[PDB]
Design a protein around this ligand. Sequence first.
Ligand SMILES: *[C@H]1O[C@H](CO[C@H]2O[C@@H](C)[C@@H](O)[C@@H](O)[C@@H]2O)[C@@H](O[C@@H]2O[C@H](CO)[C@@H](O[C@@H]3O[C@H](CO[C@H]4O[C@H](CO)[C@@H](O)[C@H](O)[C@@H]4O)[C@@H](O)[C@H](O[C@H]4O[C@H](CO)[C@@H](O)[C@H](O)[C@@H]4O[C@@H]4O[C@H](CO)[C@@H](O)[C@H](O)[C@H]4NC(C)=O)[C@@H]3O)[C@H](O)[C@H]2NC(C)=O)[C@H](O)[C@H]1NC(C)=O
Ligand SMILES: *[C@@H]1O[C@H](CO[C@H]2O[C@@H](C)[C@@H](O)[C@@H](O)[C@@H]2O)[C@@H](O[C@@H]2O[C@H](CO)[C@@H](O[C@@H]3O[C@H](CO)[C@@H](O)[C@H](O[C@@H]4O[C@H](CO)[C@@H](O)[C@H](O)[C@@H]4O[C@@H]4O[C@H](CO)[C@@H](O)[C@H](O)[C@H]4NC(C)=O)[C@@H]3O)[C@H](O)[C@H]2NC(C)=O)[C@H](O)[C@H]1NC(C)=O
Ligand SMILES: *[C@@H]1O[C@H](CO)[C@@H](O[C@@H]2O[C@H](CO)[C@@H](O)[C@H](O)[C@H]2NC(C)=O)[C@H](O)[C@H]1NC(C)=O
Ligand SMILES: [Br-]
Ligand SMILES: [Br-]
Ligand SMILES: [Br-]
Ligand SMILES: [Ho]
Ligand SMILES: [Ho]
Ligand SMILES: [Ho]
Ligand SMILES: [Ho]
Lengths: 391, 391, 391
Amino acid sequence: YEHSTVMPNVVGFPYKAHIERPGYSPLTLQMQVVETSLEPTLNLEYITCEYKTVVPSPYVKCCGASECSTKEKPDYQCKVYTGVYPFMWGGAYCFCDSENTQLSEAYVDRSDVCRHDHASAYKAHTASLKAKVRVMYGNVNQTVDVYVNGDHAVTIGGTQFIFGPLSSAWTPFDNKIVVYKDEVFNQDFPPYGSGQPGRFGDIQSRTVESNDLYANTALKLARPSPGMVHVPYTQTPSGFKYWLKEKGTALNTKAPFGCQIKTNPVRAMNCAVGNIPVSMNLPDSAFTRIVEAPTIIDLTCTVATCTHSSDFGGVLTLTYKTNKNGDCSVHSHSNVATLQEATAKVKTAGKVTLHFSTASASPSFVVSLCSARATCSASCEPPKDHIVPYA
Amino acid sequence: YEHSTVMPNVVGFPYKAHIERPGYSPLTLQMQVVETSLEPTLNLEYITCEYKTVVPSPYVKCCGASECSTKEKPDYQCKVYTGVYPFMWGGAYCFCDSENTQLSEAYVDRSDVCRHDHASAYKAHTASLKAKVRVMYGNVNQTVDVYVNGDHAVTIGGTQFIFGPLSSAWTPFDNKIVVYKDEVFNQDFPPYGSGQPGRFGDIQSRTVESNDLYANTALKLARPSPGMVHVPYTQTPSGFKYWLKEKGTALNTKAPFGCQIKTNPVRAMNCAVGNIPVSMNLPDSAFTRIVEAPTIIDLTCTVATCTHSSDFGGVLTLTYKTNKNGDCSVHSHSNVATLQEATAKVKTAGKVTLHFSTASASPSFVVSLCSARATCSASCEPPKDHIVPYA
Amino acid sequence: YEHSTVMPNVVGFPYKAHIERPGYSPLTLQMQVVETSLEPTLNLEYITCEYKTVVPSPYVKCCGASECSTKEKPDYQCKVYTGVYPFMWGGAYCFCDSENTQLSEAYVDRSDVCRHDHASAYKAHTASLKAKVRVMYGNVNQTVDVYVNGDHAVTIGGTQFIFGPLSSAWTPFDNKIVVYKDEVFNQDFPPYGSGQPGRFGDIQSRTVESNDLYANTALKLARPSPGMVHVPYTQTPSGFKYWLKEKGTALNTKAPFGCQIKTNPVRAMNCAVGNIPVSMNLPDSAFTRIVEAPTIIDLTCTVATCTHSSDFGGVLTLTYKTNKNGDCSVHSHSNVATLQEATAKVKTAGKVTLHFSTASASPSFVVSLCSARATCSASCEPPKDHIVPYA
Ligand SMILES: *[C@H]1O[C@H](CO[C@H]2O[C@@H](C)[C@@H](O)[C@@H](O)[C@@H]2O)[C@@H](O[C@@H]2O[C@H](CO)[C@@H](O[C@@H]3O[C@H](CO[C@H]4O[C@H](CO)[C@@H](O)[C@H](O)[C@@H]4O)[C@@H](O)[C@H](O[C@H]4O[C@H](CO)[C@@H](O)[C@H](O)[C@@H]4O[C@@H]4O[C@H](CO)[C@@H](O)[C@H](O)[C@H]4NC(C)=O)[C@@H]3O)[C@H](O)[C@H]2NC(C)=O)[C@H](O)[C@H]1NC(C)=O
Ligand SMILES: *[C@@H]1O[C@H](CO[C@H]2O[C@@H](C)[C@@H](O)[C@@H](O)[C@@H]2O)[C@@H](O[C@@H]2O[C@H](CO)[C@@H](O[C@@H]3O[C@H](CO)[C@@H](O)[C@H](O[C@@H]4O[C@H](CO)[C@@H](O)[C@H](O)[C@@H]4O[C@@H]4O[C@H](CO)[C@@H](O)[C@H](O)[C@H]4NC(C)=O)[C@@H]3O)[C@H](O)[C@H]2NC(C)=O)[C@H](O)[C@H]1NC(C)=O
Ligand SMILES: *[C@@H]1O[C@H](CO)[C@@H](O[C@@H]2O[C@H](CO)[C@@H](O)[C@H](O)[C@H]2NC(C)=O)[C@H](O)[C@H]1NC(C)=O
Ligand SMILES: [Br-]
Ligand SMILES: [Br-]
Ligand SMILES: [Br-]
Ligand SMILES: [Ho]
Ligand SMILES: [Ho]
Ligand SMILES: [Ho]
Ligand SMILES: [Ho]
């Protein structure tokens, strides 16, 4: 005997069957997902951070003018200044009633703070997704691992179980992301040797200790000002600093489908998409599913704040009355609005907060809490102004 | 009793079972998908449109030459012109070198037409996908909603149904799109402050009413021409206009898997990918599937026009003979060619048009109509020439 | 009667049921996947290759001032100077009062080698995914095709089979790729008219025979050097050549989920993600699944070489003892490490090599071979240094 089924891939909402095998005491099978880990394969492309300008001591020369070649230094520059000979100071500096020459030069290197303050630009692709399912068969509790890259057969309670491959493997991570501290961003970060001044990627290197530093800060050598010889130049404030102010909110709180982002190993958790098929040694006869959901009534939607076209810029709040504290499912029956989370716990208190998203100022959607529906009407404000860069 | 099954996620091709429950009159269950809505979470990055050059009145000055600083204006420019055009007040008074300094300046602001003619660049990620399934149980017809972010249990006809989560959620939308009018494009549009002259994103601002206008039109101040003082300058014709001519065909007609694009709320409809699992209170004994497909013969392929390496640039036409008007499935058994639609209605007329795609000039694939096969042979022309920009 | 099931979408690991239909001889059904083809819809954006500089005949002036306009050639460059004073005159030709003049110019065109040595930048999106399943029903063997864009009903062995739509359609290809020879890369290649000097896309054209050549090699006209008139200029070595050295490893060996890349028609093979649901005319009573996996013990992990944050930069080697040569499944129970392949053949020899990936130097994960586990401890080196471009 082999009975096949399929449970939802959502952490929380359980599967409860009432296995009444003709023999004696009836078993109450119940398996539900408790975790979901989707780790991508980060392929570090490069890292960027505050840069540090570097100009060595200048070469005071006479009319015996020199000419600077070209070395291998990040954004390295050099210019021989003719008749910029600062002129005068004490003794005799170039009596030639014509002109001397100034050999000014300067390059770039990543600030001494990169080590403990830099962002990373990885190129990630979903590597594997596995889930932990806790099955409570009668008087036995066991946790099984389920993947996408293959099924998994296990024997629990003297019964054989086979948790077929997860239907799909959805990822909230794009193919190009940027990890800063504990934050993760989905940015189409400029390629390696393609950074632009005053913008993310101002300077670039494979790693902090790397030795392939690339920069493009628009370092421009200016002509010396009479008085005390020094090296004047124009640049463009650390793009990295600029990015810090620009870069919006992280994925950490804009992840769809209730997906939760984490940073150390970098992964998406409890992402709610798909189903997990199972099968056992029992006739579809002994099997009988149980569906006991918290009955709720007097639903009421209330939108506090809401922002126009921005990943979940709205905030809905549902008031209600329940008969039993539980865990319900939330949905939107209007394509004009989308819900971030895909579930919410229903407490007898009567308060549920959800984040929604829409691109229509003044939208009118209908949210749902289990089997109850309610309308939501709100007026949203357009997205914040950007942070204009060096104009 | 719990019997599990799974129907295709294609709008049209139905599921028909013959439930012969031992009691009496036999039931004829039949459930099929009728719609599919996959809405993404657009996160407006910025919008662009035709720009408008703005040059204020010029500052006529004497040899008492002035020097222009630098204000905060889009692509703002200014240049002090030393020694321009012989004309004067009094009797050529200035004197002190130069003869005449000119303070010319000009910046940019989005054209007065952006409001009702601008494109939008959103950053979208699949937010939710739901489908409408019409189940016709015996003498009862009911429509149920099915999602990916969770299952859904419903009671219909005194029988309990549970439409498990949709297998997967495929999206024809990339992570960076551009919405113009009723069209949608998959473009890796340049980032915010990174627009280039004569190219899409010439100017950029979060919103039309925004106040973070960014531009890079390559505005260059030219020296005045003797005669009537005015402000000469070089620019680069509105990249936006250029884009209009460049931007190929929209996704609206290049969407794979028969997916249909829509614009108001922005979503993909009837996308044909996946399956929808269901389960009821009935033994696999009373269940018996029915598969009555239109039998067709004398299949014949004929390729009219075909373009090389371009999203579905070919057009196949199948002639045939059917026994009953119905709805068949179309497929390609040769990796060298791919079919856009995944189904086609079979009329007794004998005419079926399909769009195919291949990257091989002179390909030889085999299309299929239900259970009938036929060969297609055609010779394709390479893709159209691009529209070279300001050379 | 209709019994539903679901087999894994992995080439190799089979499905084996023991159909004991009360009638006579017990049947041994066994169906397994043998291939998987996911072809995308490449939409050729443009191609690039080594460029070739072109310099017309130098306008050897003398007593005039021929001025240059703006030709329509690729990145036209024209400058006119007033030197070349070695002598070269004679008087009988140029008895002028004014000094010499000279108008030099150049433009670009793709090297004569593009035809048989160029890369291509396509814009690809999954078009269709089909799989070949070999079902061995009793004393009959038949191969059926299964897709995502619809189900497929077939009759084999006098029994009716319906292979529902594949759960999902995972693709290892991004939305922007680059095909070179037999290699495929996932690169966010610069758009059409947006190429940069000394970088991939130096020059760009829709096709090799195209007539929309675009270039940006930073061609700079230099002033002639006294002696023999010629045309001096500065450029930037073929970005294409640079790319050749830069462009890392191809997708061909970094494809996740054991996916295998191919080049002629361009597709991903045996990609192991998902499940394939089936159904027949038999009670869940006659059905009984069989799961006979090779029992292995004395597992031992040994990491040879390992590279930090780079798509599968590590290499694990498992030693062991088996009871029967077979085919096992490999997994990682630690989010800190991911396995490339999703299966491995188990020979009595006792040697299995796997590629893993992690972003943590000095990681400690636990690999698995069927039902056996083992720990892996290794220390990895950071990713190679990039290849700094023209500094
Ligand atoms: C297989 O798994 C089954 C289900 O999963 C749970 O397994 C356990 C082992 C954990 O790993 C959980 O994380 C899993 O969810 C097992 O069944 C569960 O067993 C556990 C262990 O006893 C039960 O834990 C208890 O949880 C409740 C939670 O509160 C809510 O309970 C329900 C909702 O489910 C409602 O009534 C209501 O909404 C409640 O709010 C909690 O009350 C308990 O916690 C308190 O007591 C424990 C010890 O008794 C203590 O550790 C905590 O600090 C809590 O506070 C006080 O502690 C002191 C001493 O520490 C006590 O003296 C005092 O009484 C406590 N005061 C309070 C706050 O009342 C407790 O942790 C859980 O309820 C079961 N889940 C189910 C099915 O409902 C199953 O046992 C296992 N297999 C088997 C059968 O072996
Ligand atoms: C359960 O669902 C069944 C099927 O639902 C389908 O609905 C369509 C619209 C799609 O969504 C499909 O994918 C669904 O599967 C229901 O059965 C359907 O019943 C209707 C009516 O019996 C059928 O629809 C008709 O089909 C005929 C062809 O036989 C058309 O001529 C007809 O066109 C018109 O319909 C409008 C209604 O908007 C009428 O006002 C109009 O006059 C015209 O009707 C025809 O009028 C002329 C007089 O001028 C008369 O001579 C014709 O007899 C009359 N036609 C009929 C029969 O209506 C319309 O499209 C549909 O074909 C049936 N589906 C099938 C093929 O099984 C069933 O009723 C549902 N159960 C319940 C009660 O909820
Ligand atoms: C179904 O496939 C099997 C392979 O699994 C075929 O069996 C092979 O039979 C030949 C000759 O009898 C042997 O040399 C192989 O070793 C067999 N393979 C195995 C492991 O069974 C079988 O013939 C096929 N069924 C048909 C078409 O009759
Ligand atoms: Br990149
Ligand atoms: Br961007
Ligand atoms: Br592009
Ligand atoms: Ho600025
Ligand atoms: Ho041009
Ligand atoms: Ho990009
Ligand atoms: Ho260089």
